[PDB]
Amino acid sequence: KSVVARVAPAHPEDVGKGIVRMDKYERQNLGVSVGDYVEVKKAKSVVARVAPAHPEDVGKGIVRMDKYERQNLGVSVGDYVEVKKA
Numbered sequence: 001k002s003v004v005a006r007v008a009p010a011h012p013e014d015v016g017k018g019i020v021r022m023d024k025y026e027r028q029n030l031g032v033s034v035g036d037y038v039e040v041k042k043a044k045s046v047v048a049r050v051a052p053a054h055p056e057d058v059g060k061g062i063v064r065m066d067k068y069e070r071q072n073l074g075v076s077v078g079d080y081v082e083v084k085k086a
Contacts, residue, residue: 023053
């Protein structure tokens with residue numbers, strides 16, 4: 001129902017869009033498709049739209065997150081977050 005993913009920084013092309021990138025292993029465990037929304041949780045929660053993973057990241061258990069969402073949650077690159085379907 002909820003997975004743990006490692007925070008990685010969004011690529012520059014994704015700036016300001018409010019998306020997170022996760023591969024098919026994490027998406028299947030969550031039961032979400034590309035285009036659906038997830039709640040990303042540390043000590044509080046944010047909502048973000050699911051986009052596909054970069055090929056290089058596949059299998060690494062990463063969620064790519066833009067700085068707006070990272071700063072809101074107070075998470076550093078390399079920290080872990082909980083993800084669940086919204």
